[PDB]
Copies of this chain bind each other. A is one copy, B any other.
Amino acid sequence: TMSPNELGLTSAQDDGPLGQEKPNYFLNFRSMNVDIFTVSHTKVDNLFGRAWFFMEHTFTNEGQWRVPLEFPKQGHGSLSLLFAYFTGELNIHVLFLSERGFLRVAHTYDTSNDRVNFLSSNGVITVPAGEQMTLSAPYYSNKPLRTVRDNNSLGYLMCKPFLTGTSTGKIEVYLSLRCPNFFFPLPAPKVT
């Protein structure tokens, strides 16, 4: 039968270990699970499998653009802030807004600035002007885990455009991840 513990009478100091799926009942109540869709939208793989805006850059010349990639404190991706460590594939969505040219894109977790001077070794997929690509950067991280908060939690992204004439433009960036491994959930974030 039902114990008084499952009826509401408990002790907060007896909750450890963390993660106790204890059932709560009353005479007219029972945990009822109802699913409205064929799958879950709470699973890390599904939720995060959907991109979210990151930032935009306007380029008037080929100069290279390197930006630290970090988890959002803004979109649905904020749900990541509930975790401390991450590891796994990283989907980067880049849009090249230009009239005539090409955009070199590359990703590295390496903090050294110089390693990115010769962009070709790193990757540098090519998005023709007016096209958008989605490259999935692997976990080539020199650190087993990525503190999820760091201003560079995610590796740096490189964008250099091979323009042809006076043409200029702007590069919008969106980020998403493939199968994410989060660990050791930390306390919920505050609001600004």
**A positions within 8 Å CB-CB of B:** 37, 50-53, 118-121, 138
For A120, list chain B residues within 8 Å (CB): 51-53
Q: Within the oligomer, what is the number of copies of this chain?
A: 3
Instruction: Point out the residue from B37, B53, B119, B121 that lies within 8 Å of A118, measured CB to CB.
Output: B53
The 9 closest A-B pairs by CB, nearest first: A52-B120, A53-B120, A52-B121, A51-B120, A53-B118, A50-B121, A53-B119, A52-B118, A37-B138
A119 CB contacts on chain B under 8 angstroms: 53
Which one of A118, A121, A138 has the highest number of Cβ atoms from chain B below 10 Å of its Cβ?
A121
Name 9 interchain pairs, CB-CB below 8 A, sorted by A: A37-B138, A50-B121, A51-B120, A52-B118, A52-B120, A52-B121, A53-B118, A53-B119, A53-B120
Closest residue of B by beta carbon distance from A47: B121
Residues from chain B with Cβ under 8 Å of A121 in the complex: 50, 52
Q: Which residues of B contact A37 (CB under 8 A)?
A: 138
Which B residues are CB-close (under 8 A) to A51?
A: 120
Q: Output the least CB separation between A48 and chain B (Å).
A: 11
- Cα(A37)–Cα(B53), bound, Å: 30
List the B residue with the shortest CB-CB distance to A140: B37
Which residues of chain B are near A53, meaning CB under 8 Å?
Answer: 118-120
A28 CB, min distance to chain B CBs, angstroms: 23
Chain B residue at minimal CB-CB distance from A122: B50
What's the least CB distance linking A161 to chain B, in Å?
Answer: 14
Distance (whole angstroms) from the CB of A140 to the closest CB of chain B: 8
Residues of B near A52 (CB, < 8 A) are 118, 120-121
Residues of B close to A138: CB separation below 8 A: 37
CB distance from A117 to the nearest CB of B (A): 11
CB A50 to nearest CB in B, in angstroms, measures 7
List 7 other contacts, CB 8 Å, given A50-B121, A53-B118: A37-B138, A51-B120, A52-B118, A52-B120, A52-B121, A53-B119, A53-B120
